Amino acid sequence: CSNLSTCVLGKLSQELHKLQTYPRTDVGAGTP
DSSP, rough: SSSSSSHHHHHHHHHHHHHHHOSSSSSSSSSS
């Protein structure tokens, strides 16, 4: 985040990354 451009782009990129696959939330260790 620099001013607004990098901030919004960074936010959207992070949101996309957080999902990635999204098997109803990226828990992984559901029933380990």
